[PDB]
Structure 1
Amino acid sequence: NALVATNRNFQRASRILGLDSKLEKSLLIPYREIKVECTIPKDDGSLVSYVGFRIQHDNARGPMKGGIRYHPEVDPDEVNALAQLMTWKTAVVDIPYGGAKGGIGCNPKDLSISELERLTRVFTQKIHDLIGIHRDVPAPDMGTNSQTMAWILDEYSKFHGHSPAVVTGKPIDLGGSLGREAATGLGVVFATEALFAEYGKSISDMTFAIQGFGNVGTWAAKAIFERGGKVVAVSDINGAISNPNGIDIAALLKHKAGNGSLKDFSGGDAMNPNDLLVHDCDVLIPCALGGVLNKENANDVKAKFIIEAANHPTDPDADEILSKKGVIILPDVYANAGGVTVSYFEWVQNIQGFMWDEEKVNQELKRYMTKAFNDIKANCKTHNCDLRMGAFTLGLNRVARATLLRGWEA
């Protein structure tokens, strides 16, 4: 549902900035769209043919950036919207990139691992002249992973020499960054610390409920727990657990790790996962699916803060119902941006030919997230708007300023 959410947010932000109508149309037209044939021999010799693609939306603020999806469902308009969302998101946290999105229309469960490698190399052979370290830097996405990126790196480097910075999300052995897996969860916590400091409160003052215990949910709960937060309720798709004292997340992660369901963790009480969103607590954090907060449950939300860790968790309905209940909402486009920020740091480390240790990675993540919250809050004063429009006007205005500085003559 990124399509309708990004278009509404762009439109509302554009109207706040008063963007000139002809600049807006240019900003909406992608820099370049590419489709290429990817034919490979299967392991038995016979042929399969797919179409690979790359939408390169904008590069006014620097090289394009975004994921590669190996997925059968390819809608050109959703891909355009995701690339465009990367352009705004990078500008919100002031990393020097524009947005792109690409992939191949295939089902990776139909392909062996040798076939996946051959497909990835042929894709790279078909697009290498269109990507690059200062041109367009791919990353994992639905259906791809760090091993995919190793194959892209290896094949790209035959055409342009050894180029570690041409992709992010690489394995550690080949130039990947430390702290990549925790970065989104940890960034969520850094961002909430900045928000709470605006009221002179800190994380150790609050109770939290967390919906989803995936990559973001586990790391976000770890970071809250180590900073003195009381996590009082944790949900995932199966079961859920609560504890008004605060759940021992350290123990809960160990329990999940040894193949344990939440519902049978001894350090809490089993609860219905459908009751998580309306749990009694200070802060709610959706980390699972989007659109879970609508107008049927919005008035029932007990939290006074919503940290949008998942993408698009609250719809327009709830956004207003909660806004007049006094609930402050920290928007997805900013709050979960620790991922793209550390992927930038990976690219920096490769460019500088010298890796950072993990303390340095987390030190800069915190600097970037804190500085972005202050820029957002400053915009909310200038335009007297909520934090979601502070964020979008910030990124949109930064892309517009760079576009206008660069000019239009040939």
Structure 2
Amino acid sequence: SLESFLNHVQKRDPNQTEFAQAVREVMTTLWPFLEQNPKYRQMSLLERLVEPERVIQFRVVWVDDRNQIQVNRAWRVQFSSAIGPYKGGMRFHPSVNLSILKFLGFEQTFKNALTTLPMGGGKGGSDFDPKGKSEGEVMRFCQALMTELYRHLGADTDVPAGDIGVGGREVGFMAGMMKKLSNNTACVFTGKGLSFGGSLIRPEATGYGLVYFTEAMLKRHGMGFEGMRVSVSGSGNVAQYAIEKAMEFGARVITASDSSGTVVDESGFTKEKLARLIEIKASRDGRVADYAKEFGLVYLEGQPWSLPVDIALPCATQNELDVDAAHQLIANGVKAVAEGANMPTTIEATELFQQAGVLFAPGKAANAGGVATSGLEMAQNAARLGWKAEKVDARLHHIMLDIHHACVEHGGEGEQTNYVQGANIAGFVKVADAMLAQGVI
């Protein structure tokens, strides 16, 4: 069954520990669905889905400031182009191998297709370590790498972006060299600067979208983001604008945390408090403890899951929440939980909410805002226009809504809807249904 499939795939390419785990975590969740609908099991769909459409390894030779020639290996996995062009990020890290990029692009194939946007799946990068390198060395590398990759990308083929090791600067260098060589001014990279093609709300995406998806499911029942106590963890793009958008909604947030402790404001955050926080902690670098002191707020060293709230918005790190912390919240009366980071809740902790009655929102769907806007950026570049914040926000909003409605039609008919299963399936279905109608290949 599940074990046999993985064992046959392992044969194709062992030693890929990362990718082996990727295929395992995805298939496991889809199997209960594949049994119900064998329509997606035939014609070697799963066998073709695990196999990347195209993988590109190429030599990259540049020169450091010591006039010493350096040699690195860059990749770009054209994993899947079923829904749309290969959409994904580029990673510059010395510990990057094919297996890692192969698993990133794999999951990306689903996360992207889940955003309703016509985007494929693919990842890239190199074993280049940007740390210590001057701006010139990082540039010459981006160009030395682009002198080859430029022939493999395109506005309707592969549209990379940013990731670990590749920030707004690197994207600018790659997008620049791309434009010169090809002599084309189409959107080849997303996450660009506002000066040449970048999109607004770029950082505010993940945050706002989180509130929209939470609002989408809440109001679809008998509740809403109105006059509700909201606990929020973490401090960053995901948390900052999640706290703000939650304030634009009737809700009343009362928490925020860092790697150290957590601040508590029973009265609730204000447009000014959040501003004095971000400006003097997210850029100062910085500490959450020094914030509570300023505003005389109650600082706690430990996790804002102790305070009773109607909504919980975990936005810190993968597995930042556990079961025992959930038992306290449910006992109090929490009715909504949405993830901001990767996966703040464990399988055991998540099930503790669902079987309880609490509405849950996995990061696979909630924090989609980041990806959703990288797709809305391509949308702007397509119409030759420059959408203002207001216009972009309205689109990001509806996109987040269609993401919610996508999970609605999956698990279950009643009595309540499961977003964890609804999210895993949604992404697969669109990629699968599309991969079937287009034939072989």
**TM class, shorter-chain normalised?**
over 0.9
Q: For residue 358 of structure 1, what is the aligned residue in structure 2?
A: 389
2:290 aligned with 1:269, yes or no? no
Structure 1 residue 344: Cα displacement: 1.0
Q: For residue 203 of structure 1, what is the aligned residue in structure 2?
A: 225
Aligned residues between the structures: 409
Choose from 90, 111, 115 the match for 2:137. Answer: 115
Structure 1 residue 348: Cα displacement: 1.5
Give runs of aligned pairs for residues 324-335 of structure 1, distance below 5 A.
324-335=355-366
Structure 1 unmatched runs, 5+? none
Q: 1:191 to 1:385 in 2, by over 3 A?
A: closer
Q: 1:218 to 1:54 in 2, by over 3 A?
A: same
Q: State the SS of the aligned residue for 1:272.
A: strand
Structure 1 residue 6: Cα displacement: 6.9
Q: For residue 84 of structure 2, what is the aligned residue in structure 1?
A: 62
Amino acid at match of 1:283: I
Give runs of aligned pairs for residues 9-28 of structure 1, distance below 5 A.
9-17=26-34, 18=37, 19-20=40-41, 22-28=44-50
Q: State the SS of the aligned residue for 1:122.
A: helix
Q: 1:275 to 1:350 in 2, by over 3 A?
A: closer
Amino acid at match of 2:438: R
Q: For residue 314 of structure 2, what is the aligned residue in structure 1?
A: 286
Q: Percent identity?
A: 29
Cα distance in structure 1, aligned partners of 2:19 and 2:228? 31
Q: 1:331 to 1:138 in 2, by over 3 A?
A: same
User: Pairwise CA RMSD of aligned residues?
Assistant: 2.2
Q: Is the 8 A contact 2:258 2:287 kept in 1?
A: no
Give runs of aligned pairs for residues 6-405 of structure 1, distance below 5 A.
7-17=24-34, 18=37, 19-20=40-41, 22-258=44-280, 259=284, 261-263=287-289, 264-265=291-292, 266-267=294-295, 269-295=297-323, 297-302=325-330, 303-381=334-412, 386-405=418-437
Cα distance in structure 1, aligned partners of 2:49 and 2:93? 27
Cα distance in structure 1, aligned partners of 2:160 and 2:421? 28
Listed one character per residue, the Cα deviations across residues 333-375 of structure 1 (whole Å, up to 9, x for unaligned) are 1100111111111112112211111111011111111122122
Q: 1:354 to 1:256 in 2, by over 3 A?
A: closer
Cα distance in structure 1, aligned partners of 2:278 and 2:111? 32
Cα distance in structure 2, aligned partners of 1:293 and 1:3? 26
Structure 1 residue 95: Cα displacement: 0.6
Structure 1 residue 268: Cα displacement: 5.4
Q: Is the 8 A contact 1:237 1:273 kept in 2?
A: no
Q: 1:212 to 1:108 in 2, by over 3 A?
A: same
Cα distance in structure 1, aligned partners of 2:337 and 2:296? 23
Cα distance in structure 1, aligned partners of 2:19 and 2:255? 27
Q: 1:3 to 1:210 in 2, by over 3 A?
A: farther
Asked which structure has the greater RCO (Cα within 8 Å, sep 6+), the reply is 1
Cα distance in structure 1, aligned partners of 2:305 and 2:100? 28
Listed one character per residue, the Cα deviations across residues 149-170 of structure 1 (whole Å, up to 9, x for unaligned) are 1211111123322234000101
Q: 1:228 to 1:52 in 2, by over 3 A?
A: same
Q: Is the 8 A contact 1:188 1:336 kept in 2?
A: yes
2:440 aligned with 1:408, yes or no? yes
TM-score where L is the length of structure 2: 0.87
Structure 1 residue 75: Cα displacement: 4.3
Q: 1:62 to 1:218 in 2, by over 3 A?
A: same
Q: For residue 11 of structure 2, what is the aligned residue in structure 1?
A: none
Structure 1 residue 14: Cα displacement: 4.1
Q: State the SS of the aligned residue for 2:209.
A: helix
Structure 2 unmatched runs, 5+? 1-17
Q: Is the 8 A contact 2:229 2:309 kept in 1?
A: yes
Q: Is the 8 A contact 1:70 1:143 kept in 2?
A: yes
Q: Is the 8 A contact 1:289 1:313 kept in 2?
A: yes
Structure 1 residue 300: Cα displacement: 3.6
Amino acid at match of 1:324: Q
Cα distance in structure 2, aligned partners of 1:326 and 1:193? 17
